[PDB]
Amino acid sequence: AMKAPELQIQQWFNSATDLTLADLRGKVIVIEAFQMLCPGCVMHGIPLAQKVRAAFPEDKVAVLGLHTVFEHHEAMTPISLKAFLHEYRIKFPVGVDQPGDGAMPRTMAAYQMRGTPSLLLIDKAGDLRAHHFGDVSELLLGAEIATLLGEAAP
Amino acid sequence: SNAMKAPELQIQQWFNSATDLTLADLRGKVIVIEAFQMLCPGCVMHGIPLAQKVRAAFPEDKVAVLGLHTVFEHHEAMTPISLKAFLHEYRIKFPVGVDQPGDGAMPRTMAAYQMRGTPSLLLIDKAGDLRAHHFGDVSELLLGAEIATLLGEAAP
Amino acid sequence: SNAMKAPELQIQQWFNSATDLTLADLRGKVIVIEAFQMLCPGCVMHGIPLAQKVRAAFPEDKVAVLGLHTVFEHHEAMTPISLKAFLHEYRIKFPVGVDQPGDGAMPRTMAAYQMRGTPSLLLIDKAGDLRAHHFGDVSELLLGAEIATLLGEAAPS
Amino acid sequence: SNAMKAPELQIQQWFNSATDLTLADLRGKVIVIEAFQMLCPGCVMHGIPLAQKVRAAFPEDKVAVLGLHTVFEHHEAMTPISLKAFLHEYRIKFPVGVDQPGDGAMPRTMAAYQMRGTPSLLLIDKAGDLRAHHFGDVSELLLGAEIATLLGEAA
């Protein structure tokens, strides 16, 4: 039906461990898929993910970044991303999506994302429940997160 | 004046420019230089958009707008390959010069101008003298006033 | 036993390789890894020519030879665009992996292996265990002896 | 004279030098210029060591030794960013000038001297005329002889 595909991560930043979705079962998971050089991610996507992180507690809601480099690959390598996350004070876990055989990296391809910024919501069972591309109403995102937090744990 | 000649640009490479621009090529124009780092949040939010507003407000024949990429930290994260993509993604079309690597962390032009950080905005007159040097937030009213003052002066 | 476990490679990208190579992929081969920086004079003068001799002296079916670009200084001078040109000019044709950036200066695989600098030469047995770890100058007679010893050992499974 | 006047250097940036050096600055000294690319194996193995051998054999006051980084291929791989680190790693301390990038692949000093490739070694006399232009391997005996001859000529 709707099981969220496993993350395929080359390298994690801001994380002691190699996080998987299975590690996060029982939490609502918000994934911000972004490119560090995408003006919409920097202006809207990343700040939204920071608002979510600030508005909901860690024990109930996981917020993750997924750096899905599908263009200008040499300009946005993990060494660039490391500096990005430092300069923009981004503290939540951020996974480098595993580069693919072509332009799109593996997690992006598995989720059939249209590009960036994309926001994915996974429920406590690990099912994919929303997938927003571009601008997101904060009111409606809040509504969706609440709907998922009000559901029973597996 | 007690004004002094603007030191010559020391550029490693140019983006968005058919030629290797010098301040001497630009003699007779008022020159606006936006010194920035591409991973500096204040440069991306305020400094570059301000330089674009100047470009849109004044004609090319009268006012030159240049970007100067002055990387003084995280050098490996802001190499010319990254800058090229950044200019493309942000649709920045005016000429942008990569400042040459310095003896230490600060690059050559930045040091020559004794710049204190980024974003910094420099204004050079028709005669090639440095007339303003702003670090950080700049009032658009004040900036327009200064540019008009320099435009109102007789060509050299 | 003196056979410590070999950490999994943490690589950002590969040159001269169709696939993302892992040590698990290479199980059953003796693996020689040359960890180098492209601007390190000892790597250019000695380490890389040694890796190429190993590659020429042993068959690909039995011995894998891998380069690991472990940039721990002057990071901006030794980025992958620079490495690509270096591998071309020096005709280095075996797979070369760029070590992932670390928390600090040292990259991740280099730190995992507790390397002292470059060049370093690491030898991993058919079972995936680290068996030698040489820093700097290496005796070709003694390295050839170590590779034979490892090749002499029974396959795993 | 006998010999073509050496064309002016067209340098984007100098390393290991307090000033923007010119051939005119060095009138009255014999000048040895080693044109090289930092990723060129023959430059690293033979050309730069030769320049260093010259610098060690002859006093600073009589013989100037300059490097000229003439990047004509893999341009993006050998910028001054990478050259700064290379000079440090290899402990090259003599003045090194980045040749001004050209319109095409060849930078401007390289094109002005019609160099065949790297390493190339140029010899300029005390009067500023080009007296030798070598490509690839150079005989140290021959080079020493050529330098002595130029050093033997009047002011």
Find out whether D40 and D70 touch, Cβ atoms under 8 Å. no
Distance, in angstroms, between C101 CA and closest chain A CA? 6
CA distance A143 to A132: 14
d(CA B105, CA B9): 18
Q: Nearest-CA distance from D27 to chain C in Å?
A: 35
Per DSSP, the three-state class of A140 is helix
User: Contacts of residue D48 in chain C, CB cutoff 8 Å?
Assistant: none
- Residue of chain A minimizing CA distance to C76: A79
Number of Cβ atoms within 10 Å of the Cβ of C53: 14
The reply to whether residue D77 touches residue C74, judged by beta carbons under 8 angstroms, is no
Question: Strands D120-124 and D96-99: what pairing?
Answer: unpaired
SS percent in chain B: helix, strand, coil, step 5: 30, 25, 45
The angle subtended at Cα C86 by Cα C84 and Cα C88, nearest 5°, is 70
Q: What is the DSSP code (8-state) at residue B47?
A: I
Is the CB of residue B54 less than 8 Å from the CB of residue B151? Answer: no
Residue B152 sits in which domain range? 1-156
Looking at the complex, report in whole angstroms how far the Cα of residue B130 sits from the nearest Cα belonging to chain A.
Answer: 31
What secondary structure letter does DSSP report for B104?
S
CA gap A12, A20 in Å, rounded: 11
Tell me which amino acid residue C78 is: M
Strands (E), D11-142: 11-15, 30-36, 63-69, 96-99, 120-124, 130-135
Please, which residues have CB within 8 angstroms of residue A119's CB and are 6 or more apart in sequence?
A30, A31, A32, A33, A45, A48, A49, A130, A131, A132, A136, A141
Residues 11-40 of A with CB under 8 A from B: 37-39
C35-50 burial by CB neighbour count: b if 16+ within 10 A, else e? bbbbbbebbbebbbeb
Q: Determine the residue of chain D that is closest to C83 in CA distance.
A: D77
AA letter at A31: I
Helices A138-149/A46-55 angle, 10° precision? 40
Residues linked to residue B124 through DSSP beta bridges, in sequence order: B31, B130
Q: Tell me which of D40, D86, D89, D92 to substitute to probe the interface with C (most C C-beta atoms closer than 10 Å).
A: D89
Contact list, A74 vs chain C (CB under 8 Å): 80-81
Element (H, E) at A81: helix A78-87
- Residue in the block written with tokens 């390493």: D119
| CA atoms of C16 and B100, how far apart (whole Å) | 32
Region of B14 on the Ramachandran plot (φ > 0 left; ψ -120 to 50 alpha; else beta): beta
Q: Does A80 touch chain C (CB under 8 A)?
A: no
Q: Which residue has the tokens 């480098």?
A: A96
> Which letter does DSSP use for residue C146 in this model?
H
Tell me which residue has tokens 């997938």. Answer: A131
CA neighbor of C131 nearest in space, from C117, C111, C152, C107: C152
Structure tokens at D103: 């319109």
Of A74, A79, A99, the CB nearest to C75: A79
**Ramachandran region of residue A89, left (φ > 0), alpha (ψ -120 to 50) or beta?**
left
User: How far is residue C124's CA from residue C23's CA, in Å, rounded to a whole number?
Assistant: 9
Q: Which of B52, B78, B82 to mutate to test the interface with A (most CBs of A within 10 A)?
A: B82
Kindly give, in sequence order, each residue whose CB lies less than 8 Å from that of residue C4, ignoring residues fewer than 6 positions away: C129, C130
Tokens of C72: 């721990």
Cβ of residue D76 closer than 8 Å to a chain B Cβ:
yes
Q: How far is residue D62 from each of residues C19, C141, D90, measured CA to CA in Å?
A: 57, 48, 25
> How many beta-carbon pairs below 8 A join chains A and B?
40
- Closest by CA to A141, choosing from A21, A16, A31, A1, is A31
Q: Extract the tokens encoding B124.
A: 């050079």
Touching partners of A (3+ C-beta pairs < 8 Å) = B, C
Within 8 A of D85 by CB-CB distance, chain C residues are 39, 74, 76-78
Cα separation, C67 vs C37, in Å, equals 10
Q: Does D90 sit within 8 Å of C77, measured CB to CB?
A: no
Longest dimension (CA), chain D: 44
- C76–B75: do the CB atoms touch at under 8 Å? yes
Asked if residue C49 has a cis previous peptide bond (ω within 30° of 0), the answer is no
Taking CB atoms and an 8 Å cutoff, what residues of chain D touch B101? Answer: 80-81, 84
Number of domain units in chain C? 1
Contact at CB, C74 and D89, closer than 8 angstroms: yes
Question: Are B85 and A75 in contact (CB < 8 Å)?
Answer: yes
CB B96 within 8 A of CB B14: yes
H or E segment and range at residue A50: helix A46-55
DSSP string over C33-64: EEEE-TT-HHIIIIIHHHHHHHHHHS-TTTEE
- CA proximity to C51, closest of C62, C35, C37: C35
Amino acid identity of residue A118, one-letter, is: S
Is B23:B122 a contact under the CB 8 Å cutoff?
no
Q: Does the beta-carbon distance from D89 to C44 stay under 8 Å?
A: no
Contact B93, B61 (CB under 8 A): no
Query: Structure tokens of C8?
Result: 């999994």
Nearest chain B residue (CA) to D84: B101
In total, chain A counts a number of residues equal to 154
> How far off is chain D from C91, nearest CA to CA, in Å?
10
Q: Which of C10, C81, C101 sits opposite A79 (nearest CB)?
A: C101
Which of D11, D13, D14, D87 is the best substitution to test chain B (most B C-beta atoms within 10 A)? D13
C90 at interface of D, judged by CB pairs closer than 8 A: yes
Q: Nominal resolution in Å?
A: 2.0
Round to whole Å and give the CA distance between A103 and A71: 7
Q: Do A37 and B78 touch (CB under 8 A)?
A: no
| CA–CA separation, C39 and C136 (whole Å) | 15
CATH code (residue A102): 3.40.30.10
Chain A residues with beta carbon closer than 8 angstroms to that of C79? 79
Contact between A82 and A37 (Cβ < 8 Å): no
Kindly state the helix (H) or strand (E) to which residue A121 belongs, with its residue range.
strand A118-122
Contacts of D75 in chain C (CB under 8 A): none
